[PDB]
Design a binder for this molecule. Structure first.
Ligand SMILES: CCCCCC/C=C/CCCCCCCCCC(=O)O[C@H](COC(=O)CCCCCCCCCCCCCCC)COP(=O)(O)OC[C@@H](O)[C@@H](O)[C@H](O)[C@H](O)COP(=O)(O)OC[C@@H](COC(=O)CCCCCCCCCCCCCCC)OC(=O)CCCCCCCCC/C=C/CCCCCC
Ligand code: HAS
Ligand code: HAS
Ligand SMILES: CCCCCCCCCCCCCCCCCC(=O)OC[C@H](COP(=O)(O)OCCN)OC(=O)CCCCCCCCCCCCCCCCC
Ligand SMILES: CCCCCCCCCCCCCCCCCC(=O)OC[C@H](COP(=O)(O)OCCN)OC(=O)CCCCCCCCCCCCCCCCC
Ligand SMILES: C/C(=C/CC/C(C)=C/CC1=CC(=O)c2ccccc2C1=O)CC/C=C(/C)CC/C=C(\C)CC/C=C(/C)CCC[C@H](C)CCCC(C)C
Ligand SMILES: C/C(=C/CC/C(C)=C/CC1=CC(=O)c2ccccc2C1=O)CC/C=C(/C)CC/C=C(\C)CC/C=C(/C)CCC[C@H](C)CCCC(C)C
Ligand code: HEM
Ligand code: HEM
Ligand code: CUA
Ligand code: CUA
Lengths: 147, 32, 581, 581, 147, 32
């Protein structure tokens, strides 16, 4: 018929879409945030793990400001570095969008969003929060300056 | 009766898709 | 029609739009708040987030879920030719009205500026949760006490006759809804109604985000299915009166797909939540590319029934591709042909909402756009593009046909869909580009700080994309004011003829008695066994293996297990219910 | 028609569009340069400002001024029913072709990246100035040697008969042009052709900005008048074949206004130049609100001739306001009705270009928007909205009618005006808002520095308005590629019938032999005495009392009196010429 | 007829437009740049004329950069001040757009564009140039910082 | 025959003008 032609068109379309998203998610790993569990108490955080490039960032998201170091809404990181960003809110469900990169994770209380990005191009990377977290949400951001 | 028009309308779809989708996918890749 | 049933239907057509007038008002005020022109942090005593709770709830919880039961009362009583039951309609409308009033109180006063999704542990006033639950759960009483009978009666009396498409569509739709109330009616009643009016002191703020998107996502298809029963039965007859709805079995198949594949898909709204084990988000970004298939079967059936209908009244156009689409009544007045303006300006917006949804689900690609301003691009061109415009058309048509008024200001009506489609274009375009390229976030006042050229949180790059959307806001405010003038003038006066319950129902070019489908039993069971075999994993997470402590409840202005197995052994036992029918 | 005249007209219809293909190519590349996506400072060896010289010259100097003489050859030979003169057409086309080739050389190679206005003391290569002068001055030889006779012959032989509207329009138009070449043909030949190939060593860089906008502004109305003779004579016949052109005397009046009031207005382009004594800029911001009147008389005559025509083929629509505009052939194929797509998608863009021009002239308000990105909003929706779309329609139509080909790919044609109107909307809108609110300037690469998120001249606020216009650029690139495919397929093949020179000429619902107008003598004299009594002051300035020294000539890549009285005593003596006629 | 109605509509429109632009140009003087001539040699310039508020600014516009003080593409001015801005290019026709205010004047060689604005709201006022002035035009601006 | 439609189309013009124009005029005044 013609319904079969429409259907094979839709099917080849969606199969192409899906083959590519699984390709990008497996090769050249752009891994969506998964479940990570080692200990993760998490009200703190930043460690210069392997010195020049590797890091471990712990952006606890208190209510109405982020916490990149011990109470410092901004942070400075050497270029090219490859951070290991863990995110966990203190109180409510908090968005953590890092505008330059594709780090778009929720900070759910009692969970530890893991994702591993590298800051190839210098500049400033605003860490904005999108999910709603009460009044005084619109004034919740903080920068990851990569000079 | 053969719906010869909707087949071409689909061909126009899913090439409008698979262009919008591919632009946002390329934004995904271009973001490191 | 009856004398009280006409009043029921009239209330459920007018009360939802009389309430949606505020939803649209604050929609405009939001595209002014976000575009940095009405800065401050409030207006007329309704701050941004509380007006946003309203623009969300009013528009997709109290508007649709009420208009759906109204229009379904209508279309089922008609297609079955049965007379509705008043002592049931009455308690149904009573519960929906009381529920909406309890939800709109304590949302206007400011007790529940939580949001229309009420993401915990951000609790609201119990009159918001009990209100919304009563609103929702009070639209089933029609389904289960009014036209499950009188369709079991209409069936058996024939008895070898398919169920009409218009009522098979409402059956698939309300079976969907009956199923997907279980999740949110467990989440609310057992996590947020206990946490508010504190009885419990803790909550699982991931299990209550799951168990929500087990309701937030089947509800889009619960809205979409009446738009589709319109597009199938009423569109090919508001086009030339020789329209036929090519391939009735294809429509029944699309409905069966929205039955099975719309329930297990809800995990693709929380792709970035950190608890849920990845490789389940992948299965659901697969079932999403599966439930976006029936809509691409509808894009074929309702684009052929548009071709068969047109090329039946213009034998010249025979075997001509692309030259019809010009002989369609785009802006015709004069007799069930204004409605094509709505159905078409809805189908275009849906054309765009579909690719935007397909993108949004590509779970990798959902990192580019999650909770950016892209997502309002998705669900404005879907909801407020097709579902809302089709509901507008049917509102005008039914308020006419069952009150007597022919239709008043019909020209303003016919124009309304085009102001609406162009406002939604001029607005969704700016917001989608500004949400992809500069991360313009979603649910953020963004006009008081992120666009205050004085605040230390300025982010200049966003001003362009936010000041090129105010015109979309204005333009669709005018586009809705048009339809609203037309509706009020239609409801008001004057009665000219008998108040009947007609509907232009097209009928089945290619008809088939196909009994593999047409069998909601043994497909409802499929839809229930799936969507449990696809929520065991994410509900195992978010309950154990996903969280490390439970969270108290925070008001919006102050830094202050069995609950799963119950909904599991509740869905899997809804099978006795939907099998005895 | 003849055998060589058809070749002349075909060259002047094809050579201008075959050249405008580069104008459009670099238009797209510019809306990519300015929106910060093709940064650098060049592309394929054509840097931004040289490609801008091209996109300006090619499009409004060598495209229009050639298509105008082509289409006027056609419409005059037809409406007078006279056969054109070959030994005149030949030298006319020879001069225009040689001139355009001399201007396009030394503009492609890079010798004249000055700009299409060649604002001194920024001189170019003499082959650009002599080229443009020869191009312009070589389109008069038709007017003065071909159809000033054969219209003096057609008149006297009748002899009591008005001059047809189609040829009275071209007469007003080319009288305008004959007058307003005097300024720029004095400026070039006596200031910039001497300064280049250095004979003089100085220049008056204000007197050569005046004496230019005494040509830059009457040339917009020189283009606009053939678009208007189309809208008057050809539109009401490509609408239903009962169309009539309501009020022929109103059309003749509008033409007489564009004769008198389009010449003295040119000082409203240099409102911010500091020499010219203010309170003359005010008189010209008055004559601008005066010359924007005939276009608001045309907006009435060509919106009534659109109503009389429609309500003549639909006696139902009688005495119905607003419901026609729906019965117009917006997207009809099949026989001089595709052309309505062009005329209407041109009339909408002109609706917008008109208010934008009215604004731009409000000499106070010309500080908000002068040389911002607003002005491309003005002269794209005017030129590339109406003048270009009407010229496209007539190109397709004449290449068809005088070669034999019916029209090929007519569907792509019919679509082209809508892609064009929507590209121009999606692009002019972003640019107009971004030029009003954030001063997004004009003639600036603006994608290499003002939008380089690294350059110390960043100006972030501009990125929105510049990245929401790339889609307009793309969309009208597709919209022009459509028409171009249609034109090439039409020109190519195959000949089916006799190559005639037809034209659907509507005729005069309300006809009148009014001899107050119809009298180009004693109105040409008015247009010449005015526009001298309105340039004595600004040319007294900018010559004395306005400058304090003269400036040498600077190349674009390196920091390196009687000339008025001549053009005065040249205009005032053009009266003997245009009176003997 | 009806042409008379269309014409009286167009006429009342344009008369309203013009009455308002002449009103704004005469009352609440927003004067378009006119001819000024005292001496005006002009390759220099900035004077603190009346101390706290009045000034006299001489923004000579060399090729491919402005000159606000003796070779200083930027300038700082106290808030509320009411400058008297004179502009004159050195070589070619130069735009002088001052983005915050409506100061939009050409710098024609041998002319002195006068206009008198006051900087009521502090901030930074970029002095961009719009008219074309050769390659290296896109890198021609300079700020008038009003702190 | 009375062109009753263009009169209303004008009324729509010059109230579209005199709104666009008034917006840019108010930008003029708001700029000091
Ligand atoms: C205000 C603030 C300023 C900034 C806003 C700037 C924009 C302003 C509005 C722009 C449009 C104004 C012009 C209105 C009239 C246009 C002429 C016309 O509509 O005729 C139609 C053709 O429709 C069009 O496509 C024109 C729309 C604009 C251009 C779209 C370009 C997209 C690609 C081209 C689409 C064309 C088809 C190609 C597809 C591949 C012809 O209709 P017809 O059926 O052929 O008519 C035949 C007729 O003779 C008759 O015999 C028949 O019997 C019919 O039954 C009757 O038809 P009709 O005459 O009544 O025409 C009805 C038409 C309605 O047109 C519209 O207005 C829709 C346009 C969009 C909404 C405009 C809102 C503005 C106010 C409302 C105007 C309505 C009148 C009120 C006036 C006060 O039917 C349709 O056109 C349906 C729409 C079809 C295309 C939808 C897509 C439009 C948007 C495109 C994408 C935008 C986003 C871009 C971002 C993504 C990048 C691509
Ligand atoms: C009724 C309301 C809704 C419908 C319908 C709907 C359909 C889809 N959605 Fe959705 N949605 C998502 C994926 C989809 C997909 C794949 C589809 C599919 O059903 C869409 C398929 C549609 C078809 C593919 C369209 C083609 C068929 C039509 C009929 C074409 C017209 C045919 C033409 C030829 C007709 C002729 C006329 C002219 C057009 C030519 C995702 C993805 O991960 C997210 C969250 C992302 C982020 O992380 O939160 C999401 C978020 C939402 C929200 C967010 C709520 C809150 O703000 O978070 C809402 C309200 C919503 C409503 C709706 N959504 N959706
Ligand atoms: C052919 C090309 C052009 C036309 C025509 C044109 C018409 C006007 N212009 Fe202009 N222009 C200016 C003022 C006007 C005014 C008052 C009119 C008037 O003629 C416009 C009147 C138009 C009517 C008021 C429109 C209404 C009539 C139509 C016919 C309505 C449609 C009717 C509907 C009902 C039909 C039905 C269909 C639907 C629409 C409903 C000013 C002001 O001070 C500047 C410089 C500002 C800045 O400082 O440089 C300027 C700058 C330009 C440049 C700049 C060159 C370089 O970039 O600097 C170009 C090329 C240009 C071309 C053209 N211009 N103009
Ligand atoms: C045969 C040539 C094929 C070449 C195709 C090239 C495709 C290149 C990709 C670019 C994408 C843009 C698509 C533009 C369509 C071009 C087709 C066209 O203009 O001509 C085809 C058709 C007329 O030709 P036809 O119908 O075959 O002639 C019958 C003879 N009795 O045109 C028509 O009259 C029908 C077109 C519909 C017009 C729509 C008018 C309403 C405005 C909004 C439209 C939205 C709905 C349509 C959606 C599907 C679009 C195809
Ligand atoms: C009588 C009520 C008066 C109320 C007016 C309120 C004005 C408020 C200001 C808002 C400005 C937006 C203008 C919207 C127009 C609303 C008018 C309307 O929809 O109804 C009028 C008319 C149908 O009514 P009528 O023609 O009188 O009925 C004849 C009965 N046999 O509608 C029509 O069918 C004709 C409308 C034309 C549709 C155009 C379709 C093509 C798409 C682009 C249009 C561009 C061209 C039109 C330009 C002028 C617009 C009026
Ligand atoms: C996705 C999104 C793209 C994401 C961003 C793109 C820029 C990336 C590009 C991009 C990415 C970068 O990383 C980048 C970095 C630095 C500089 C520049 C860039 C850049 O430019 C934008 C598209 C948004 C939607 C899609 C617009 C939809 C418009 C309306 C909502 C409705 C109108 C369209 C519908 C569909 C009508 C269809 C019916 C009919 C046929 C009309 C024709 C329209 C056409 C589609 C044929
Ligand atoms: C002027 C200009 C306004 C200037 C800027 C405005 C924002 C000032 C507002 C503004 C000024 C500030 O100082 C400011 C300061 C701080 C914050 C915010 C602001 C602010 O918001 C923008 C308008 C540009 C033009 C005008 C858009 C034209 C669109 C296309 C070019 C063509 C489409 C429209 C044409 C006309 C079609 C008409 C036919 C038909 C009827 C369709 C209906 C359209 C409608 C007009 C009825
Ligand atoms: C009429 C013009 C409308 C405008 C200008 C408008 C504007 C907006 C804007 C800008 C947002 C984004 C708010 C944010 O992300 O913070 C929004 C959200 C939303 N809109 Fe509207 N809207 C309109 C109509 C509608 C309609 C008709 C519907 C549905 C029937 C609708 C449903 C929604 C929903 C569900 C949200 C999400 C609210 C939330 O995120 O909680 N809108 N609206
Ligand atoms: C087809 C799509 C087109 C696009 C995307 C486009 C793009 C542009 C842009 C962005 C500008 C501004 C350049 C600047 O200000 O620096 C411009 C200038 C201009 N455009 Fe185009 N254009 C197009 C077609 C046309 C057409 C068809 C015409 C006239 C027939 C035209 C005439 C002009 C003129 C005269 C200028 C002024 C150039 C100058 O200032 O020297 N454009 N174009
Ligand atoms: Cu933290 Cu929103
Ligand atoms: Cu200095 Cu351009």
């Amino acid at each position: 018929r013609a319904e079969k032609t429409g259907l094979t068109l839709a099917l080849i379309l969606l199969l192409t879409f899906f083959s590519l998203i699984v390709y990008a998610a497996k090769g050249l790993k752009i891994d969506i945030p998964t479940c990570v569990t080692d200990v993760e108490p998490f009200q703190e955080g930043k460690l210069i793990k392997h010195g020049d490039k590797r890091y471990e960032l712990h952006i606890l998201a208190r209510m109405w400001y982020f916490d990149f170091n011990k109470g410092a809404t901004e942070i400075k990181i050497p270029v090219g570095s490859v951070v290991d960003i863990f995110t966990t809110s203190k109180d409510v469900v908090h968005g953590v969008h890092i505008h330059g990169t594709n780090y778009n994770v929720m900070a759910i209380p009692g969970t530890v969003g893991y994702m591993r990005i590298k800051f190839e191009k210098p500049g400033v990377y605003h860490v904005v929060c999108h999910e709603f977290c009460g009044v005084g949400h619109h004034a919740m951001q903080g920068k990851i300056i990569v000079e | 009766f053969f719906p010869s028009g909707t087949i071409a309308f689909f061909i126009f779809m899913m090439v409008f898709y698979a262009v919008l989708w591919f632009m946002i996918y390329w934004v995904l890749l271009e973001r490191g | 029609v009856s004398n009280a049933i006409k009043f029921i239907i009239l209330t459920e057509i007018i009360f939802p739009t009389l309430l949606l007038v505020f939803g649209i008002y604050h929609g405009v005020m939001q595209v002014f708040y976000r575009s940095g022109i009405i800065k401050a942090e409030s207006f007329l005593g309704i701050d941004y987030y509380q007006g946003l709770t309203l623009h969300g709830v009013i528009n997709v919880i109290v508007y649709t879920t009420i208009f759906i039961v109204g229009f379904s009362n209508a279309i089922v009583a008609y297609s079955l030719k049965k007379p509705l039951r008043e002592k049931v309609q009455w308690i149904a409308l009573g519960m929906m009205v009381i529920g909406t009033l309890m939800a709109a109180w304590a949302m206007f006063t400011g007790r529940a500026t939580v949001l229309y999704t009420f993401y915990p542990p951000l609790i609201a006033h119990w009159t918001f949760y009990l209100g919304a639950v009563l609103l929702v759960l009070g639209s089933l009483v029609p389904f289960f006490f009014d036209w499950i009978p009188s369709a079991i009666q209409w069936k058996r009396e024939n008895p070898d006759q398919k169920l009409p498409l218009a009522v098979f569509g409402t059956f698939v739709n309300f079976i969907l809804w009956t199923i997907m109330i279980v999740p949110v009616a467990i989440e609310i009643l057992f996590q947020l109604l206990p946490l508010s009016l504190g009885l419990v002191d803790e909550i699982n703020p991931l299990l209550a985000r799951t168990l929500f998107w087990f309701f937030g996502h089947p509800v889009v298809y619960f809205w979409l299915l009446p738009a589709y029963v319109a597009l199938y039965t009423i569109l090919p007859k508001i086009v030339s009166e020789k329209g036929k709805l090519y391939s009735d079995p294809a429509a029944r198949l699309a409905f069966i797909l929205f039955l099975i594949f719309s329930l297990p898909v809800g995990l693709h709204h929380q792709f970035t939540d950190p608890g849920i084990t990845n490789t389940w988000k992948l299965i659901h970004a697969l079932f999403t590319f599966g439930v976006a298939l029936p809509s691409m079967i509808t894009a074929f059936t309702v684009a052929t029934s548009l071709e068969y209908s047109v090329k039946a009244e213009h034998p010249e156009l025979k075997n001509s591709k692309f030259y019809w689409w010009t002989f369609l009544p785009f802006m015709r007045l004069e007799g069930n042909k204004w409605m094509f303006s709505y159905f078409f300006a809805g189908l275009v917006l849906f054309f765009i909402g579909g690719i935007t949804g397909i993108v949004n689900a590509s779970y990798n690609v959902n990192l580019v756009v999650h909770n950016t301003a892209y997502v309002p691009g998705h669900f404005h061109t879907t909801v407020g593009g097709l579902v809302l415009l089709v509901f507008f058309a049917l509102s005008l048509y039914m308020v006419s046909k069952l009150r007597g008024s022919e239709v008043k200001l019909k020209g303003l009506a016919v124009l309304a869909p085009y102001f609406w489609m162009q406002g939604m274009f001029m607005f969704s375009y700016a917001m989608m580009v500004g949400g992809v390229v500069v991360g313009f976030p979603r649910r953020t006042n963004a006009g008081l700080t992120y666009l205050n050229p004085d605040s230390p949180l300025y982010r200049p790059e966003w001003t362009g994309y936010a000041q090129l959307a105010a015109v979309g806001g204005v333009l669709l405010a005018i586009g809705f004011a048009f339809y609203f003038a037309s509706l009020i003038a239609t409801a008001l006066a004057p009665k000219v003829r008998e108040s009947t319950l007609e509907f232009p129902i097209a009928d089945a070019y290619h008809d088939a008695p196909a009994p593999l489908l047409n069998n909601l039993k043994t497909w409802t069971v499929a839809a229930i066994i799936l969507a449990v075999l696809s929520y065991i994993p994410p509900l195992y997470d978010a309950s154990v293996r996903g969280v490390f402590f439970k969270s108290p409840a925070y008001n919006e202005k102050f830094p202050m297990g069995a609950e799963k197995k119950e909904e599991k052994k509740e869905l899997s036992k809804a099978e006795g219910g939907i099998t005895q029918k």
